[PDB]
Amino acid sequence: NQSAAELVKNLYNTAYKGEMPQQAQGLTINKSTKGDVHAAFGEPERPVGGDNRFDLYHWNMGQPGYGFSYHKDMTISEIRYFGTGVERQLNLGGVTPEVLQKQLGPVNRVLTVPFTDEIDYVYDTGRYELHFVIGTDQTADHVNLKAK
């Protein structure tokens, strides 16, 4: 499951830039805007509105799902990586709290998630932090990137 390992490694790496890899490349926390996100990804499959504070982009084939929340000034406040639906084992489906240990060493923090039964393994990445949100089964549901 080296695909999931290389993923965790690539996520940890780009997190120091305040970006996520692949399709989300060059969209920087507190720097890139809602406008840049829309320019890159098109219109969301579920946009900001109501109890939803994320521009949501559904996973499509091998292309993963993403969520973008913004500050008042319209710059990115958080990036949420959802993995894919098809062959999920190759990404977040294969991301366990143990592969996080084998790849990134010990975790900085373990935090509670409000309104859910998930556990968040936090890795500090310079000015930013990577929140690996693991579900009831030992697999990742989504990975969050935000400023420290």
UniProtKB/Swiss-Prot annotation:
The keyword Signal applies. Keywords: Signal. It comes from Bacillus subtilis (strain 168). This is Uncharacterized protein YjgB. The gene is yjgB. The keyword Manganese does not apply.
